[PDB]
Design a binder for this molecule. Structure first.
Ligand code: NI
Ligand code: NI
Length: 132
């Protein structure tokens, strides 16, 4: 949370997961804010500024579920980490196709449009321990 972070992650209580947006993504996100807005008040409780590399680390939010908690990411971020992410998805036992269960602006920018999708795809985060 200094000022070099390429991405920001926020908790999405309604999806029992977390979202992630990036510095170069201008879209609105399920948290009701763009990266710019989140950046303007970043470390607060509920969200933190991070390096994209962190996302594919064995340590990534380890205590709270790791990768499994991610329900939304910009398509561009998925592309940037794809190979790395699929790898981690497999080692975590989520299946190589886990990345396709994660929503993006290709599905929606709000919780309301996203939940339906997460349910259809049987996203793991919906049946895990309460994120909080
Ligand atoms: Ni920082
Ligand atoms: Ni920084």
């Amino acid at each position: 949370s200094c000022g070099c972070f390429e991405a920001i992650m926020a908790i999405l209580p309604e999806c029992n997961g977390i979202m992630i947006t990036t510095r170069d993504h201008a879209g609105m996100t399920p948290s009701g804010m763009t990266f710019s807005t989140l950046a303007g008040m970043i470390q607060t409780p509920g969200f933190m500024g991070i390096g994209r590399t962190y996302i594919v680390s064995k340590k990534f939010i380890s205590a709270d579920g790791g990768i499994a908690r991610i329900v939304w990411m910009p398509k561009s971020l998925k592309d940037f980490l794809h190979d790395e992410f699929v790898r981690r998805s497999v080692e975590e036992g989520l299946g190589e196709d886990f990345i396709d269960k994660i929503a993006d602006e290709t599905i929606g920018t709000t919780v309301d449009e996203i939940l339906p999708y997460l349910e259809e795809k049987g996203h793991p985060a919906l049946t895990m321990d309460p994120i909080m």
